[PDB]
Ligand binder design. Sequence first.
Ligand SMILES: [Mg+2]
Ligand SMILES: [Mg+2]
Ligand SMILES: [Mg+2]
Lengths: 61, 521, 61, 123, 61, 61, 61, 32, 61
Amino acid sequence: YKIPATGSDSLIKYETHSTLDGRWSALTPGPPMATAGPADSKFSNSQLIFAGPKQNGNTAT
Amino acid sequence: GVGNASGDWHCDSTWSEGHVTTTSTRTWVLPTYNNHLYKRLGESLQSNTYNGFSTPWGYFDFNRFHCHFSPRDWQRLINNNWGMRPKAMRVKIFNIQVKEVTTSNGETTVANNLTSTVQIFADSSYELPYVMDAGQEGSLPPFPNDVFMVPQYGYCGLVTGNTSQQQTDRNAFYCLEYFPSQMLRTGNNFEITYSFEKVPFHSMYAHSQSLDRLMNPLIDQYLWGLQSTTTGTTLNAGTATTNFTKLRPTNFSNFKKNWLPGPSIKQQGFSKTANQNYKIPATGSDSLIKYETHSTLDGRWSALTPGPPMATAGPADSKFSNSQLIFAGPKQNGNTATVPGTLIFTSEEELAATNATDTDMWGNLPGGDQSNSNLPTVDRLTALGAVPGMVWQNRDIYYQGPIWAKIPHTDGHFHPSPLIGGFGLKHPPPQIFIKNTPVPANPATTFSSTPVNSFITQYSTGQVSVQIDWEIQKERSKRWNPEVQFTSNYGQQNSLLWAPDAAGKYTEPRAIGTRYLTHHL
Amino acid sequence: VPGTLIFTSEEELAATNATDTDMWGNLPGGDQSNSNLPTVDRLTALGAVPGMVWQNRDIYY
Amino acid sequence: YCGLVTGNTSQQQTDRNAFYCLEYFPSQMLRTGNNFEITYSFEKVPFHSMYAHSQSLDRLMNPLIDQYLWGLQSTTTGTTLNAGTATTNFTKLRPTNFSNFKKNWLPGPSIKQQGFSKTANQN
Amino acid sequence: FNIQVKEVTTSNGETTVANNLTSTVQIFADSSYELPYVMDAGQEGSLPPFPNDVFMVPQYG
Amino acid sequence: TGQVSVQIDWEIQKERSKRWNPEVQFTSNYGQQNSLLWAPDAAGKYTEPRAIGTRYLTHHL
Amino acid sequence: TGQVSVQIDWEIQKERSKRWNPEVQFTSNYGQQNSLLWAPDAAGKYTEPRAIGTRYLTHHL
Amino acid sequence: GVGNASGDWHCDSTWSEGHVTTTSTRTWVLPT
Amino acid sequence: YNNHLYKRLGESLQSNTYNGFSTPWGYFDFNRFHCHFSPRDWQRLINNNWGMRPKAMRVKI
Ligand SMILES: [Mg+2]
Ligand SMILES: [Mg+2]
Ligand SMILES: [Mg+2]
């Protein structure tokens, strides 16, 4: 679904998050749970993502 | 003997390194309760249904901090130490005086009964229902000059269902005469020593760091995360694209973290301003207990209060909840009030550094699975139990609050820190029972097997000393700037606070917690 | 016919444990005000919370 | 023995599945005159509790004494909801209002189960 | 033990009781069985079953 | 008036039966009671509700 | 075919209650039975008629 | 003497192997 | 058993799906209370004790 990075409808809103003193903190990686395979077409905040060997910038599509 | 005191008065506090000993002496008065009888209690009141027994015995309660610390001593404690815990305890009951009361045509007259006794025993094996840890009255008064009445011992039994007080075969009856007890005449005294099991130090500090801000604000993470699923700033608009980003400064809310805020259960928030609340009656099918967070045990409702340690509203905020302890203010003598200003509200706002907020929620989570055609609802996580990686701080102890609680005799318990505050102990300070031994009045001169029910009217009085050794841990901070300190800052006062007024009445004007000093996470 | 079977019970656990077919309790569905009375939500499932105690189930012959 | 089941539709095993051959262990061989013996000690475990509680968790207080703690009793005057005069009615928590007493402990964790009747037509 | 001898005095109104510190009570056990034994006749006068009950010492006859 | 203490040492012999099935046992089985039996009532009066013998266990001849 | 012996040493902790009134006790109370329960029947078949837990005695919290 | 109790209250029962001791204390009143 | 063979087990049955092996071996199970206690012994245990736990075990074939 098309969810922007900023605004009232930013991604942090639709992602599982804890609330500490009114501030949102994305639940990530979160409690140990079974995730999708590393090669599956899906992922979540429960998975650690590292920069690949050809990733030098700080953003990627 | 008769003309020789069986003990002296002792009310000081000795401070040393890592230790402080409090000593408190008070005068007590013990009347004859239940007219020497045991009465079976019970009443069918829906969620208030209960059964049990009132006994003719009285008992001593030392379970409040102000019984042991003067306000100045409490200040010495909280402004300089990060932790404290009880270590040992010694109790003495002496200078016993049994009085005989006689009524005549005019006024009543009192006289010493030198041969009468009082019975005293400590339930050191915990064979009797423990009630000294229920946040109830009966403890030694905070002021050394005050004389108090020894509270009557009574206990509750098993309640079955949520409508009848009827007892079953499982209900127990405990006769206290069935225990061995010391009998004391005016010359005798009673003493008992007790050691506390090792318990963790109470944390007497507020955190100067937030759980979601434990990172170096200058460095990026080597971890990546999804930033958005479209281009632009509008929802359901733009070009679909999985935008990933290295997690770096000023996006702290999305940083990968190792720990989570502790468990929480949403409480209902009410305004101190009357017209800001919905109109909910005290009784009926729509009573307040219904709209307040409550647990259900065997069909009976029990308001969640104070409940699990959570961040609450400031003590001066316009709102409060059942998570906050409320004490009677200095001018509150009745048992009801419509003006919150006459009451003292405590607060656990310092807990916002690691604990979730009581009237808010632990967080949010998806109501379903999202896709290019389905945007799940944002569900609220109003209640959440222990999850791996959670951390939290217990609620604070107060000057006028409880010290210990008996951890329930059960197979399982999670974090046995009493919710009203204090130290959870498996073997708490033993209950000490006292009773005026019955003295039969003039009997008939013909034998009768009927139990005697005519007694001489009596009451006793004496002194009680309680000494507690406390272990304290001095703050050892490297903080450069000045800390917050509990300070006397009432300004000009017609009558000095924390002191008896012109009429001689002593009252506590404020609640004093223990969290002024700070500590990083 | 259930009469041919032997049913065990953990009714003695009602002294400290919640009832299995009931709920742990209730909590507000939202925030109340002079114009909003929140729904009374049911707490049908609840994990370990500080201050909880319970008895294990019984062993049988 | 059962092995690792992957997914919820196929019994197919993966490389993670293990096969254990018991002949691959050392064993005593016994003819009609031989016997086998083995001793074992249990680790320290808690005692099973062979008792029912004669007290309720929400009734651990002295039923004769008031609490020195206060609580909100109601937010209006009367007995009707959304009626009466708005007022923050506070009260000292005292006997026969045990449901509102401040307590130190809570009932343990729980997960709602479905209840069925032993009477057929009631389900 | 804990013997207390009370002196009773009557007046115009009610009667008053007072301790008589110098008065005695006499006690002896018929250890040689020289007196008629009556403690085994299924009669009243034994200590009451309830620990809190106060009883009247039965008259010997 | 005074106090009286009585202490009795009793010799007992435990049953040592080889009986396989459960024995009869004296048990509290009064069911629901407005006022717990073998306990003082609301007015504080203590009464014994039943006679209890000593023959629940069995022995062969 | 052969025999198998199993011996278990159990540690037990006696109840040490101060409760005054009688406790609930597991008791044989099946009344008149054509064939004694917890015993083989006329055909020699042995069956267990009831489930027996371990919670008859009580304890306060 | 006068202001000193000449005994204490004792009402328990101690169970052992092959033995049990009962202890009972009561208050009595003796008229003339 | 299995005619001396090891058979690979497995069946696709949705939530009942399973895989494994049946072996030609048998095994001894002592994991039930009634294997060790007679009904009368169980009664002796539960009517007089607040707690119990296993301490040691010895098996002979
Ligand atoms: Mg006090
Ligand atoms: Mg227990
Ligand atoms: Mg008698």
